[PDB]
Design a protein around this ligand. Structure first.
Ligand SMILES: CC(=O)N[C@@H]1[C@@H](O)[C@H](O)[C@@H](COP(=O)(O)O)O[C@@H]1O
Ligand SMILES: CC(=O)N[C@@H]1[C@@H](O)[C@H](O)[C@@H](COP(=O)(O)O)O[C@@H]1O
Ligand SMILES: CC(=O)N[C@@H]1[C@@H](O)[C@H](O)[C@@H](COP(=O)(O)O)O[C@@H]1O
Ligand SMILES: CC(=O)N[C@@H]1[C@@H](O)[C@H](O)[C@@H](COP(=O)(O)O)O[C@@H]1O
Ligand SMILES: CC(=O)N[C@@H]1[C@@H](O)[C@H](O)[C@@H](COP(=O)(O)O)O[C@@H]1O
Ligand SMILES: CC(=O)N[C@@H]1[C@@H](O)[C@H](O)[C@@H](COP(=O)(O)O)O[C@@H]1O
Lengths: 266, 266, 266, 266, 266, 266
């Protein structure tokens, strides 16, 4: 894997946005061949969405032929709720870019038949062929998407029960009221993510240091599902400074040597 | 994976038997489309076989269209020996249910050409397509079937040399005479097991606590082959109380929350 | 996996050479169906190449229908440099055996288009179908080929940046001048190696003890890429005495019991 | 050690306060033979101080002949400043009980000679003889007061440098401004603490779960200073529920069984 | 420490007995200056007691001036009861040697004041001065007598609660009925043991392999009490073959080389 | 502990030498009150001895009233022999400073009674009182002098057996012939070292990286004797850059911040 050792969240967002833009422009998407982009929500991707929107306004990128798939969504939460991932995505991205409504794909957390909703989501991805770039984040306990500890490393899209710690962490968005945080979520699986051509994970803060250590220096295991990246042929972790504190000196030294030239330029 | 935290061996057997029955009845097997069931031997599955037989006698299940494959068998041990897995299976299951003789598949530990015997076993499974549910147990040192420590995680059916500790453990069935325990066995491989649609492992006793910890909280590795379950899309571990002592409190708490409703009802 | 516990480097070379010879002669290669052999360089395979050459001179083996692929090569290093892997291979093997020039495949570390060179190398392997036996070694830090720490376990042939420690270790061949050691190399990937039918790794010296421990008793992880062997269906590690010092007593005992008969005979 | 597995911080405070009172009254302190109590600050001991104060108000305990020693203080900071441990101790405890000023001992951060003051503090403790009970908390990283990771396990009272993470954890009381949190502070040493007759550590919150695991199931090491308790003949850890989530099931089970009768009524 | 790598329990007993005799005769005890010997119970020391008794019968050693202290006893249990450590010690040792009753020290589980008795036991040891040699065993979980996991490494003689696993391990001598195995017992402490001039631990069986690994290669920690030996200036572990299986090859190799001449003739 | 993160061995030697001089001159030794200095041999302390000698030549320090004790020596080897620690100490230090012969203490490997000599060495140290500063190095496996893995953490001066790896590591000075490297040697103990008022360990080279990690981030254990420093109230590790590569980023970051002003000018 590649690990981009940056300093601030601002830099991480600019780097991630530029990488997405560069992939899209080199791909040259069309109506017959769209660029498929996987997306996450949360506080981590905020600076990236900001940079992407700016780049679009400047005419540096167009999403007219970009199809998106989000990694997850809360179950039972009204779609119109400000904290639903649907709301998050339109507010921070879709509302501001030229992406067609038919090109947007989100999991329906209120679908009557849960397994059916998830199965059709996988079918939708299959209709296109593959996700060219899936961007995501990592949980304090190492989850990728909502693939909580003890989730199959070959899992597909399905419903999952969030850990109490994940609910506490996410309660920051529900007025610090853990009881308002949904208990279940629909999430793409580890296998679903591994099927993507390229995976780019954003990592910010000291709160993510242990998870970054697990992803980079730890072993492949289903407790810290982010470790699945070790099995992916093209994974990139874009990190800020605080997030790298638990890595070994030689490890960070190596990544700094590799990316010295690829980090200076914004 | 799913982990069913039960209390006694009796409960484990009733839960496992019910799961098998439910899978079969929902599948609706026929002569053109049989339900393929993988089976284990040993002291662990005893209460499960007992429950299955009871359920059959009550007309709750029929094996007329169920095809079985056992995971292993001792090499060189006369088929008529009471401790051969062939004898174990007929005595505790086949003799008591309506399963056709042509539907039963067992490895011949006395075959003249070992590799040939194993190859044909894999071919037999392939003739059906796939094993819909493979039930098994776990060794004190973490083996699944007889895939002893340092067995390929992509192994196929083959002959294996048992560890001295495995022979000592199994000597309980040979009048506590380790020298009477066969040194070799034919066993389906880790890859063979991973090809099954669903894997259900029964775990009983304090003697299995370290192996359960390895399977659940440990890393993927070939020393404790049971760790392969982390790579399987549909694995279930059915455990008694003593077997969960080495897990973290938060881990058992999570599984208890998930299965609270699925455990009460027998 | 199989682990052959031998005593000296001489024995390791004789055992590895015999295994290669036996595989080739049983295969019976022809112009329509050649035997594809993957090869390494370095100080480790020296006694093996010596034994192979001797066996060829004695008429025990012919390479007329053997196609070879080397695992790596230094980038930017003149092909004519005595320490290039190209030079190493001709000097220690090709110059002494009846293998056709068209049957030899080596990565061109001075190719103008790096990704293109690597892609065509993979295509060349694909043209044959598969590598029947890939022989290699292991780095002090556990690398297989030049798949340095944090290399994808599903990687393909590509350019890699060597770790400072790898350069120091290899400096022994550049007059102990680390600054003369190339910084980059083209190397087959972990996935490339996993696609081989059989992988045989030679392990010599106390300097490799920690790497052997990682490969055998450690977990699957991308830091010690040699751990990928746990995912391979047919891997063999041929070791000398010093290299086994970090293994557990029971582990070495098991391998000694398994190979007792397969080690005496040269 | 003893570990008291309680549910809430309210229960922890009541248990800890009762223990202090029990020890004080059994000792029956006098002017010539005072009971010496070591004390901590921060949010952790809040429920204990409140409970202890109410016990005093009800006439169950008197501090007329109780001498106290606090574990730390800021250097060069005006004692009057609210963000001083002096201010904390008076506001939350001393202001509300009958302890004489001459019986209160706090490190003077404004001492003319630091190394002289710290020496004097140790001298003062020996002047009485020993601290009969030292109450404390534990940091997220396992620290005790200012004995940060890598502090000698035989350290005495001295000046110390705070970790960046510790400053961030305490910035909460500094208007979330880390720039206001002191970088140094006078603190009793690990050896100083170990010399106490009994040590009682309060553990509250999920943020302390890893530290508790290190203290209870980890090895003795100076990175997690709390591990020092394993070397003490009379240590007690009073915990709430979330702080115990990282412990093994059998560990928590053991302490629950042992203290079942000692936590009734809370 | 010294580790004596022997093969059978018979050899272990002969080596340990000879060591005790060697120490006793070199000391040359008298009425005013007795040799103080600490002793254990259970199945582990059986071959040692038998060998020691035969050495006495042959006139190679006398216990006329040897004072003994046993590590533990049950509380509130009639001394007369066969399942008492008093009964064990007499039946397997005292009944057969010339030690005077006044020289025998066993904790009185029927003491009117437990905390008073334990204190008296420590007092008795100091009355002589010190224990010159303390022989013991090790539990499957690393315990020593009743110093179960999480016992202070500086503990003194006191009352203690047995783990459920310990009770199960000893239920063998209680008709396999755990309900008959006492839940408590008076036991010397880890500190008590460390105060002995020399400590010799007997290690027998595969069931002790993990404990031996913890004692020899693990870190100092109170979960595996046997790790305390690393803090003692004169400790010796006398082991049989199966108990050494979890150690590293280099570890066992080291002790074999060191004691090669010291184990000849057994 | 304090860890001084320097870059080169030249800087390490200058820092360590200056520290020794600072301590000596602050102490102001006299005939009746000498400064006692513990010393090591090998390649590690070379830059320190050279720097110390130049400081003496410049008149910044005198050894007229400095008494020295070296950590070890070979047994039965002629003191005259060049490959003796006596010869090393004089050639690299004593020959160049004004220390009187009567102030030099080295273990006599040719003592008529070894156990008597070692006892005498400890006696000599106590005759002065204590060693004020003991300088040492660390072995690749964490050893200190001859306190090889599995040496008691409370060991005194005694005779010891070297590990095979230690002999190989030192064979460099023995014409690369391990057969010339002694198998035994008289050495001060871990307890002996811990009794010193201050301990300063020099750490140089990538070969010491794992040992440094064990000393700083590992747990107290007798396999890595250097871990004993965690139990000492005044330990200092002076390191070069490559020796710190296995430490965590946050660990090195902490020491760099702490010693930033203390390493300026080197
Ligand atoms: C309601 C709910 O939470 N259901 C999930 C199920 O969807 C998931 O498949 C399984 C764990 O398995 P996995 O993570 O390995 O798929 O756990 C639970 O049964
Ligand atoms: C007689 C016998 O025991 N043969 C087995 C072989 O069948 C197995 O393939 C290999 C280990 O490899 P695996 O577990 O990775 O297949 O070990 C031994 O050679
Ligand atoms: C010039 C160079 O060193 N390029 C390599 C690239 O080829 C490799 O793919 C990646 C790590 O990823 P991998 O080991 O997972 O492929 O690192 C670097 O970008
Ligand atoms: C100004 C300052 O911060 N001084 C401290 C010193 O007092 C302490 O002794 C040492 C760490 O060692 P310790 O924690 O092992 O004492 O670090 C620093 O030198
Ligand atoms: C009745 C009983 O079981 N009392 C013991 C006590 O004697 C012991 O001191 C403590 C554990 O601490 P220790 O093992 O560290 O002494 O546990 C229990 O309180
Ligand atoms: C001749 C010889 O090598 N004797 C040493 C002995 O002096 C040492 O005490 C012990 C290990 O124990 P220690 O390192 O814990 O003292 O090993 C050997 O018996």
């Amino acid at each position: 894997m590649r690990l981009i050792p940056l300093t601030t969240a601002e830099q991480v967002g600019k780097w991630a946005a530029r990488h997405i833009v560069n992939r899209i422009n080199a791909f040259k998407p069309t109506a017959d061949r769209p660029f498929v982009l996987g997306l996450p929500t949360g506080g981590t991707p905020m600076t990236t969405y900001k940079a992407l929107v700016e780049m679009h306004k400047a005419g540096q990128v167009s999403f007219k032929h970009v199809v998106t798939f989000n990694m997850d969504e809360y179950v039972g939460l009204p779609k119109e709720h400000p904290e639903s991932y649907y709301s998050f995505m339109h507010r921070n991205f879709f509302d501001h870019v030229d992406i067609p409504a038919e090109n947007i794909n989100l999991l329906n957390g209120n679908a009557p038949d849960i397994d059916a909703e998830c199965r059709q989501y996988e079918e939708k991805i299959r209709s296109y062929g593959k996700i060219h770039l899936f961007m995501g984040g990592v949980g304090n306990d190492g989850h990728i998407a909502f693939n909580e500890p003890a989730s199959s490393l070959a899992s597909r899209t399905r419903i999952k029960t969030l850990t109490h710690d994940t609910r506490v962490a996410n309660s920051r968005f529900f007025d610090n009221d853990v009881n308002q945080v949904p208990k279940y979520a629909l999430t793409v699986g580890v296998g679903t993510l591994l099927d993507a051509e390229e995976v780019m994970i954003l990592v910010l803060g000291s709160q993510k240091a242990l998870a970054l250590q697990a992803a980079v220096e730890g072993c492949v295991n289903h407790m810290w599902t982010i470790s699945c990246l070790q099995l992916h042929p093209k994974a990139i972790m874009v990190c800020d400074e605080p997030s790298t504190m638990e890595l070994k000196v030689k490890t960070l030294r190596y990544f700094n040597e590799l990316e010295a030239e690829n980090i200076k330029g914004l």
